[PDB]
Design an enzyme around this catalytic site. Structure first.
Site, PDB file in Angstrom:
ATOM      1  N   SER A 162       3.047  -8.470  -4.476  1.00 25.67           N
ATOM      2  CA  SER A 162       2.660  -7.430  -3.774  1.00 25.67           C
ATOM      3  C   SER A 162       2.676  -6.339  -5.022  1.00 25.67           C
ATOM      4  O   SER A 162       2.139  -6.117  -5.846  1.00 25.67           O
ATOM      5  CB  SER A 162       3.612  -7.189  -2.621  1.00 25.67           C
ATOM      6  OG  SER A 162       3.287  -6.123  -1.710  1.00 25.67           O
ATOM      7  N   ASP A 324      -4.662  -9.987   4.112  1.00 19.21           N
ATOM      8  CA  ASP A 324      -3.623 -10.966   4.246  1.00 19.21           C
ATOM      9  C   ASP A 324      -2.727 -10.227   5.212  1.00 19.21           C
ATOM     10  O   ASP A 324      -1.580 -10.824   5.214  1.00 19.21           O
ATOM     11  CB  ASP A 324      -2.908 -11.184   3.088  1.00 19.21           C
ATOM     12  CG  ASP A 324      -2.060 -10.092   2.352  1.00 19.21           C
ATOM     13  OD1 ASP A 324      -1.887  -9.189   3.025  1.00 19.21           O
ATOM     14  OD2 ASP A 324      -1.658 -10.172   0.940  1.00 19.21           O
ATOM     15  N   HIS A 356       0.555 -12.402   3.885  1.00 17.67           N
ATOM     16  CA  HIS A 356       1.126 -11.519   2.784  1.00 17.67           C
ATOM     17  C   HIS A 356       2.213 -12.150   2.055  1.00 17.67           C
ATOM     18  O   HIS A 356       2.560 -12.731   0.732  1.00 17.67           O
ATOM     19  CB  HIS A 356       1.078 -10.108   2.781  1.00 17.67           C
ATOM     20  CG  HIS A 356       1.723  -9.332   1.741  1.00 17.67           C
ATOM     21  ND1 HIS A 356       0.898  -9.204   0.624  1.00 17.67           N
ATOM     22  CD2 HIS A 356       2.692  -8.802   1.356  1.00 17.67           C
ATOM     23  CE1 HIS A 356       1.538  -8.437  -0.389  1.00 17.67           C
ATOM     24  NE2 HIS A 356       2.717  -8.041   0.161  1.00 17.67           N
TER      25      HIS A 356
HETATM   26  P1  LIG Z   1       3.949  -4.926  -1.328  1.00 16.44           P
HETATM   27  O1  LIG Z   1       4.897  -4.425  -2.388  1.00 16.44           O
HETATM   28  C1  LIG Z   1       2.470  -3.819  -1.119  1.00 16.44           C
HETATM   29  C2  LIG Z   1       2.487  -3.151   0.327  1.00 16.44           C
HETATM   30  C3  LIG Z   1       2.604  -1.739   0.548  1.00 16.44           C
HETATM   31  C4  LIG Z   1       3.082  -1.199   1.918  1.00 16.44           C
HETATM   32  C5  LIG Z   1       3.854   0.047   1.744  1.00 16.44           C
HETATM   33  C6  LIG Z   1       4.607   0.450   3.154  1.00 16.44           C
HETATM   34  C7  LIG Z   1       6.045   0.673   2.597  1.00 16.44           C
HETATM   35  C8  LIG Z   1       7.003  -0.091   3.651  1.00 16.44           C
HETATM   36  C9  LIG Z   1       8.393   0.362   3.936  1.00 16.44           C
HETATM   37  C10 LIG Z   1       8.875   1.733   2.692  1.00 16.44           C
HETATM   38  C11 LIG Z   1      10.077   1.830   2.345  1.00 16.44           C
HETATM   39  C12 LIG Z   1      10.503   1.581   1.014  1.00 16.44           C
HETATM   40  O2  LIG Z   1       4.571  -5.447   0.070  1.00 16.44           O
HETATM   41  C13 LIG Z   1       6.046  -5.943   0.423  1.00 16.44           C
HETATM   42  C14 LIG Z   1       6.106  -7.160  -0.162  1.00 16.44           C
HETATM   43  C15 LIG Z   1       6.225  -5.761   1.800  1.00 16.44           C
END
Ligand SMILES: *[P@@](=O)(CCCCCCCCCCC=C)OC(C)C
Ligand SMILES: *[C@@H]1O[C@H](CO)[C@@H](O)[C@H](O)[C@H]1NC(C)=O
Ligand SMILES: *[C@@H]1O[C@H](CO)[C@@H](O)[C@H](O)[C@H]1NC(C)=O
Ligand SMILES: *[C@@H]1O[C@H](CO)[C@@H](O)[C@H](O)[C@H]1NC(C)=O
Ligand SMILES: *[C@@H]1O[C@H](CO)[C@@H](O)[C@H](O)[C@H]1NC(C)=O
Length: 376
Positions: A162, A324, A356
């Site tokens: 991610s 995903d 994902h």
């Molecule tokens: P990945 O690193 C990429 C997905 C990006 C989605 C961003 C939404 C933010 C979620 C909450 C914000 C708080 C810090 O995805 C991981 C593995 C979920």
């Protein structure tokens, strides 16, 4: 077998906090701690009312003067387990399955003869921030890669999930080619949101409680907006058409050319400043300059755009595309673009029906990584 560094995604490693706060939002919030406790992931901190304590500790304060984030008054947040794996194997140190992240992959690596903290090491970071505020992390990462090269007698394989892929790309873009040719064997890219993800628009507008349905989306929105990494992952024009509508309301559309209006209209001007701070960090076109394995899930409905009958304080209707479930399929186009811009091989690997997070514990993903590390 080559040494391995694991780079997690957003929410992808433990964070610890220590408190000496002048005030609290509820009497049942702790003012002061003599040591660090786990602030992520601990489910007991996310229950109703208690979560106001958590939000008040884990939110970042954006300082318009310094153009930088800081912790709330009397809060420290640190990243445990740099150079180790525990803090990205289990997000919850109680080791409940809910926090099981890299654990399955590391069990497999150790089964293939790797040793935790030795020839397999984690590179956890403060995933609330974008690379512009993780300078020390990248210096530590460079030093750890060099040390592992020296101890184990060979270049390292980077394995990133991610947002970790964006952190890793930022890092590789800023290392000389000669350094990468010596120290980096390959980059295994799992579920990389190249060009950002549509889902960021909804998080910022109306909040996302999908994984915490007992809590109000408008409450968790406070924390989610405060994380620079959220604004950093808004869609980019090297992946998405500038004319693609991500957010429709009764009165206005928002494309990726409308982020300044978007941030004004949702009442979060700090997000625009965050997007300006972070949009240039990862060079649009420039490839990593290393052997790259691009693994991406398909056949999972993935939020693509949002229709709001009432904006921004109500959940939208969601329009889905391929991916995903989190990373839009269009993000994979970026890997294909890199085939013709670097001499090192770019291998694309579709994972049809791979969600994902589940892709990290999936037999087919692990079989692929095993071929990369142990050879034919
Ligand atoms: P990945 O690193 C990429 C997905 C990006 C989605 C961003 C939404 C933010 C979620 C909450 C914000 C708080 C810090 O995805 C991981 C593995 C979920
Ligand atoms: C904001 O940043 C500047 C520079 O570091 C400093 O004057 C000020 O202390 C900061 N403001 C707050 C509210 O902490
Ligand atoms: C693409 O996006 C960048 C900033 O993220 C912008 O500065 C640039 O002008 C855009 N180019 C287009 C739309 O042609
Ligand atoms: C936004 O564009 C859609 C199609 O992109 C259109 O149907 C709608 O009228 C637009 N909304 C506004 C408020 O202009
Ligand atoms: C594991 O990933 C493969 C490769 O795409 C996929 O076909 C399979 O459905 C996945 N398994 C599970 C349990 O999701």
């Amino acid at each position: 077998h080559p040494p391995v560094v694991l780079v997690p995604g957003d929410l992808g490693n433990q964070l610890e906090a220590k408190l000496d706060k002048p005030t609290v939002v509820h009497y049942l919030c702790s003012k002061k701690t003599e040591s660090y406790f786990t602030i992520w992931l601990n489910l007991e901190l996310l229950l109703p009312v208690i979560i106001d304590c958590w939000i008040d500790n884990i939110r970042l304060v954006y300082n318009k003067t310094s153009r930088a984030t800081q912790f709330p008054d009397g809060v420290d947040v640190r990243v445990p387990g740099f150079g180790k794996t525990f803090s990205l194997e289990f997000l919850d140190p109680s080791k409940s399955s809910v926090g099981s992240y890299f654990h399955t992959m590391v069990e497999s690596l150790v089964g293939w003869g790797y040793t935790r903290g030795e020839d397999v090491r984690g590179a956890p970071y403060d995933w609330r921030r974008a690379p512009n505020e993780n300078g020390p992390y990248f210096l530590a990462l460079r030093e750890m890669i060099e040390e592992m090269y020296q101890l184990y007698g060979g270049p390292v394989v980077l394995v990133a999930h991610s947002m970790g892929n964006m952190y890793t790309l930022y890092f590789l873009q800023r290392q000389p080619q000669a350094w990468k040719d010596k120290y980096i064997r390959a980059f295994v890219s799992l579920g990389a949101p190249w060009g950002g993800v549509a889902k960021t628009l909804r998080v910022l507008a109306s909040g996302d409680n999908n994984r915490i349905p007992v809590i109000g989306p408008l409450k968790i929105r406070e924390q989610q907006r405060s994380a620079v990494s959220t604004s950093w992952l808004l869609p980019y024009n090297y992946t998405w058409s500038p004319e693609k509508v991500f957010v429709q309301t009764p009165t206005i559309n928002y494309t990726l050319r409308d982020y300044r209006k978007f941030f004004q209209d949702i009442g979060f001007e700090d997000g625009w400043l965050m997007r300006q701070d972070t949009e240039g960090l990862v060079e649009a076109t420039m490839p990593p300059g290393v052997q790259l394995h691009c693994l991406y899930g398909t056949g999972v409905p993935t939020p693509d755009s949002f229709y709001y009958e009432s904006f921004p304080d109500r959940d939208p209707k969601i329009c889905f595309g391929d991916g995903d479930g989190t990373v839009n399929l269009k993000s994979a186009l970026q890997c294909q673009a890199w085939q013709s811009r670097q001499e090192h091989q770019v291998l694309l690997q579709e994972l049809p029906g791979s969600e994902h997070i589940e892709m990290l514990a999936n037999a087919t993903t692990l079989a692929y990584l095993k071929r990369v590390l142990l050879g034919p």
